[PDB]
Short mmCIF file of C-alpha atoms and ligand atoms in Angstrom, two decimals:
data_model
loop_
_atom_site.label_atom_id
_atom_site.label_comp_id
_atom_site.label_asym_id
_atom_site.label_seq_id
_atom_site.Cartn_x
_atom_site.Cartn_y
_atom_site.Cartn_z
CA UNK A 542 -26.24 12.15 -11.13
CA UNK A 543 -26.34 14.18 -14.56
CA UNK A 544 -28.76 13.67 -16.92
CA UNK A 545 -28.87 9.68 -15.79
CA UNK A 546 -25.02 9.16 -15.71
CA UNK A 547 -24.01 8.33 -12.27
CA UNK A 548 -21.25 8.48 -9.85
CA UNK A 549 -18.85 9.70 -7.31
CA UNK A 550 -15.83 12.47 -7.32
CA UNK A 551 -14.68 16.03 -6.79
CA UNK A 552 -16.11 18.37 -9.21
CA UNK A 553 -14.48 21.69 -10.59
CA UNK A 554 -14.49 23.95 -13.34
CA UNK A 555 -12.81 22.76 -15.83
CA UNK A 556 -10.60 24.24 -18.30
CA UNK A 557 -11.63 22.22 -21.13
CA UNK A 558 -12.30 24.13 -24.15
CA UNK A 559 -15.36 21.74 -25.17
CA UNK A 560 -17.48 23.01 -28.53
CA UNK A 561 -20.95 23.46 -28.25
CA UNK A 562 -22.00 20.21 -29.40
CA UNK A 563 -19.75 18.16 -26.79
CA UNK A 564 -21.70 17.05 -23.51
CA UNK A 565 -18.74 14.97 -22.19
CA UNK A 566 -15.19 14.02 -21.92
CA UNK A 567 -13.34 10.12 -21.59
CA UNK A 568 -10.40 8.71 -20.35
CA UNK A 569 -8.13 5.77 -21.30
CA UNK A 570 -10.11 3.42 -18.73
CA UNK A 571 -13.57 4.66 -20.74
CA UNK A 572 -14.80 6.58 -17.66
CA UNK A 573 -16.09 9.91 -18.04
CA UNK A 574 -13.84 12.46 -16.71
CA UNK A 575 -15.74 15.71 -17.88
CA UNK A 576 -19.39 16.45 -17.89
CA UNK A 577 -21.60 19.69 -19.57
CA UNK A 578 -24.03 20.81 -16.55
CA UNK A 579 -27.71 19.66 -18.02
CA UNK A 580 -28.93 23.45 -16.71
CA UNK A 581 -26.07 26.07 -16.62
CA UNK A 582 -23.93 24.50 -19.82
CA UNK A 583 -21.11 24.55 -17.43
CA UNK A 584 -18.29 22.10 -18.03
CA UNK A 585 -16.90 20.19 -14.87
CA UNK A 586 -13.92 18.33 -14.09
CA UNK A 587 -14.51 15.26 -12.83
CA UNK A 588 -11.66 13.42 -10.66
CA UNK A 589 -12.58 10.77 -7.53
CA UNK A 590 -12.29 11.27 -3.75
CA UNK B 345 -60.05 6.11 -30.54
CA UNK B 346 -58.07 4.03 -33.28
CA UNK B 347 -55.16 1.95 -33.51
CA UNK B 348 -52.95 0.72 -37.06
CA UNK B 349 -52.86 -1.71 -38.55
CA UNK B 350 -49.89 -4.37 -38.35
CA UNK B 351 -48.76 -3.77 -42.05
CA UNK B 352 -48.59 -0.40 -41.97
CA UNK B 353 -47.97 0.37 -38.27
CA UNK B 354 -47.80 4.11 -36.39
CA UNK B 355 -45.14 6.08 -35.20
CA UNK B 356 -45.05 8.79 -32.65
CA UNK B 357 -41.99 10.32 -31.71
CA UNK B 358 -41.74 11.76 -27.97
CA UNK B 359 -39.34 14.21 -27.50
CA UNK B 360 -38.39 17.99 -25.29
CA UNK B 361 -40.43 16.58 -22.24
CA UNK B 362 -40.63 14.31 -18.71
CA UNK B 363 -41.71 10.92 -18.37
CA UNK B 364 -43.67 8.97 -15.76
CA UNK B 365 -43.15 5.55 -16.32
CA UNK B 366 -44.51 4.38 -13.24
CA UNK B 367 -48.19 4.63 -14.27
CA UNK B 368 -47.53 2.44 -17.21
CA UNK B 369 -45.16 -0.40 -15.11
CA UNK B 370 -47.31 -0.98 -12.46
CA UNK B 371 -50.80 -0.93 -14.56
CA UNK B 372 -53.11 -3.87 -14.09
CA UNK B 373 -54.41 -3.15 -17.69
CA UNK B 374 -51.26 -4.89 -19.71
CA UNK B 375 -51.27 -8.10 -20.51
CA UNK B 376 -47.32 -8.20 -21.48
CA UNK B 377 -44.71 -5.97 -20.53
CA UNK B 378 -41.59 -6.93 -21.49
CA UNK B 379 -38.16 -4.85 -21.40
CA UNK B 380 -34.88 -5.52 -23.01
CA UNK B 381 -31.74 -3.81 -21.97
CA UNK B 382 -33.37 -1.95 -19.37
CA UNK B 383 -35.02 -2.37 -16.04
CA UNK B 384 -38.56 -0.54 -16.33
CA UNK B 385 -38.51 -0.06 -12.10
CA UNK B 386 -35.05 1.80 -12.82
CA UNK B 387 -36.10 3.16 -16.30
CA UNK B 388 -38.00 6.22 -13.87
CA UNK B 389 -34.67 7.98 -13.70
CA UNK B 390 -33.02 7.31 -16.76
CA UNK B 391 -32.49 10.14 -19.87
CA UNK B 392 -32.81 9.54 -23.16
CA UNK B 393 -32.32 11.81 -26.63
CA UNK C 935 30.71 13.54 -21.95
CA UNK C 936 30.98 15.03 -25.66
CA UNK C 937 29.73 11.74 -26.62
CA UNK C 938 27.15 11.73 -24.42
CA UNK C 939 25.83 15.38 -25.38
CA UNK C 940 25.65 13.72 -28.98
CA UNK C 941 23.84 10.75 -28.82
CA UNK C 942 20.35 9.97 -27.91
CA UNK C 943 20.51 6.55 -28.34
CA UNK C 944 23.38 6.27 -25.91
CA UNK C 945 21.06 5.36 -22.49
CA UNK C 946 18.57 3.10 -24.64
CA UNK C 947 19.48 0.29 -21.57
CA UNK C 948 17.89 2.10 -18.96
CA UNK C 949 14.87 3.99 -21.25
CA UNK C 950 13.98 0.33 -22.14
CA UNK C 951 13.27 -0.62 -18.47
CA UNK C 952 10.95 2.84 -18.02
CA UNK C 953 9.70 1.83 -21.82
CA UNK C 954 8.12 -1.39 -20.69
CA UNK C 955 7.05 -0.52 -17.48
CA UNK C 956 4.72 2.04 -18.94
CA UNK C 957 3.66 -0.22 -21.19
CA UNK C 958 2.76 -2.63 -19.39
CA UNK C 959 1.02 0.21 -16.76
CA UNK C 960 -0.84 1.60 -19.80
CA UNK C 961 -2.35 -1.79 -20.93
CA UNK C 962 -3.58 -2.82 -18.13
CA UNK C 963 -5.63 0.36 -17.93
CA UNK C 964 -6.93 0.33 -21.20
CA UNK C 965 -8.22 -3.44 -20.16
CA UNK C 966 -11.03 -1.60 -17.52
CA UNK C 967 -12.38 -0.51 -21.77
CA UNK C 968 -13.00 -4.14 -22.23
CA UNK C 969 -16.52 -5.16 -22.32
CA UNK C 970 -15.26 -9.02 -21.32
CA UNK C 971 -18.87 -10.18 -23.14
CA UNK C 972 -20.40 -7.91 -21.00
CA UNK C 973 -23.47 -5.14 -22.69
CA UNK C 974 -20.85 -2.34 -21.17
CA UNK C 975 -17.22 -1.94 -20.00
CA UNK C 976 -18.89 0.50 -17.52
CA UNK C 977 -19.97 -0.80 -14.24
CA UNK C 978 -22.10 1.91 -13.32
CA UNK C 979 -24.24 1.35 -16.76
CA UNK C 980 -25.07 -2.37 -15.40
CA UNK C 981 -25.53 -0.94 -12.22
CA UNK C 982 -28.10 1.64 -13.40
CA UNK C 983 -30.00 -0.04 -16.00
CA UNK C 984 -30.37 -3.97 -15.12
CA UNK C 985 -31.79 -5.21 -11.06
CA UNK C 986 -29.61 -7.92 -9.13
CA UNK C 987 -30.42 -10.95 -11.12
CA UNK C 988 -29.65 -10.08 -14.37
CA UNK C 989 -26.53 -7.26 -13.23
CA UNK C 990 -24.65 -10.15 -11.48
CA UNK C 991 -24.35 -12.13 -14.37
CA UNK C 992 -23.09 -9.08 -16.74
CA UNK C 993 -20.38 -8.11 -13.34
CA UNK C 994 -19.36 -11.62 -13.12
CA UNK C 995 -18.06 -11.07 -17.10
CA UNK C 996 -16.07 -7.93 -16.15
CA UNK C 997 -14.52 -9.34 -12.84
CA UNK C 998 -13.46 -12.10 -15.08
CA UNK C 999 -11.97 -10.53 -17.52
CA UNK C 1000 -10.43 -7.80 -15.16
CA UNK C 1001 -9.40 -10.19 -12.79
CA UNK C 1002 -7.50 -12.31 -15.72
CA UNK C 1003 -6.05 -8.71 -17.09
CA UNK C 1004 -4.17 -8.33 -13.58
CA UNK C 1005 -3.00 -11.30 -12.85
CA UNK C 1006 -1.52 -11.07 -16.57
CA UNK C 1007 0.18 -7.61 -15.01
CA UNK C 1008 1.76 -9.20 -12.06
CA UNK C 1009 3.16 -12.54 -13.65
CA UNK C 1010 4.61 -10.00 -16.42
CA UNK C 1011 6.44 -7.73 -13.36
CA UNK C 1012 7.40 -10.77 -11.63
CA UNK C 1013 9.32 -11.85 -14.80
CA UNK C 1014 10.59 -8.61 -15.28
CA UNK C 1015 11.48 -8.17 -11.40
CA UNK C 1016 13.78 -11.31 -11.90
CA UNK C 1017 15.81 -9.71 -15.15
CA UNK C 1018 16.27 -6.47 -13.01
CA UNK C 1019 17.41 -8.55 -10.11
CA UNK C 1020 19.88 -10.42 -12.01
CA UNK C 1021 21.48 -6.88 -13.79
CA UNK C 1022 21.30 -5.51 -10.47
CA UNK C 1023 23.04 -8.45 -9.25
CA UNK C 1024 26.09 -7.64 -12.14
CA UNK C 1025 25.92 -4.06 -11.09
CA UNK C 1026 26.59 -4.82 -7.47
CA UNK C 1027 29.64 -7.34 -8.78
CA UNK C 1028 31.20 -4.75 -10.79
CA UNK C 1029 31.33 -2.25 -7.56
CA UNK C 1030 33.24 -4.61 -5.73
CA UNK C 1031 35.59 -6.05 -8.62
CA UNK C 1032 36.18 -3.05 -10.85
C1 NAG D 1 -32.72 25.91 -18.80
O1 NAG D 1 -33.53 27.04 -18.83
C2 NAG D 1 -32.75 28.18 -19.25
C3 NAG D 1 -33.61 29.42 -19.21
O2 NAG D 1 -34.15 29.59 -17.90
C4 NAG D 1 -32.14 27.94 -20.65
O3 NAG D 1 -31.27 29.02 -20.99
C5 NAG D 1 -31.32 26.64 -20.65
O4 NAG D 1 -30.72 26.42 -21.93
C6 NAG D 1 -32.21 25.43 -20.19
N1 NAG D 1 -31.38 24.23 -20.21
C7 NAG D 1 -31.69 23.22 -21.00
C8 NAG D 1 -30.87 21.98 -21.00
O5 NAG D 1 -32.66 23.33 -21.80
#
């Protein structure tokens, strides 16, 4: 669960180069594949089990 | 102390903090308490800007 | 094979078939981004926001619409299926005769 947006996967460091103001990432199916970690600013990858 | 009137009605923005919502739901002092779009029982772990 | 190494178009027959198959893969997809009447395309929003009486109703618009976005998928392969089956029918002709 970050910052209220639920759900379930493997989660990595991603290589996306996101700018500062970006919090998250979508795919074609409007899922979020991407997320900005709510304490360290870290972006993870997000892919499902 | 003092509420406004209808005509020219208040606003107070709430912002950079954490909110309890649960001592507001589950008053006895409201006489209506009425949500649209959300659930206020599920509104205790939601974020908002 | 000089002609070959000079024309792209040359294969179009066969780049068709991997053409609409993507296509068609790609679609239905982009269909799980249709809201279907529903307040989100997202399950987990419904999920997370409304309780069990009021969530039902906005699932039951996204399993209808999903629901009628597949079986649009399978009725367009099974089409497709029979068009392959009949070229690969020709193919297997041409073996034997030629
Ligand atoms: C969390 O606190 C740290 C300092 O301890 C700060 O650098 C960071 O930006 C804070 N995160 C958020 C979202 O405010």
């Amino acid at each position: 669960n970050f910052n209220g947006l639920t759900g379930t996967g493997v989660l990595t460091e991603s290589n996306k180069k996101f700018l500062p103001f970006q919090q998250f990432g979508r795919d074609i199916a409007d899922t979020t594949d991407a997320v900005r970690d709510p304490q360290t600013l870290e972006i993870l990858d997000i892919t499902p089990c | 102390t003092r509420f406004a009137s209808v005509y020219a009605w208040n606003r107070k923005r709430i912002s950079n903090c954490v909110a309890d919502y649960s001592v507001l739901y589950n008053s006895a002092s409201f006489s209506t308490f009425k949500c649209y779009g959300v659930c206020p029982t599920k509104l205790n772990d939601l974020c908002f800007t | 094979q000089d002609s070959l190494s000079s024309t792209p178009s040359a294969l179009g027959k066969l780049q068709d078939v991997v053409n609409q198959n993507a296509q068609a893969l790609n679609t239905l997809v982009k269909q799980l981004s249709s809201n279907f009447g529903a307040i989100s395309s997202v399950l987990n929003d419904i999920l997370s926001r409304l309780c069990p009486p009021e969530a039902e109703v906005q699932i039951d618009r996204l399993i209808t619409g999903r629901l009628q976005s597949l079986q649009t998928y399978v009725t367009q392969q099974l089409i497709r299926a029979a068009e392959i089956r009949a070229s690969a029918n020709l193919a297997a002709t041409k073996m034997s005769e030629c």
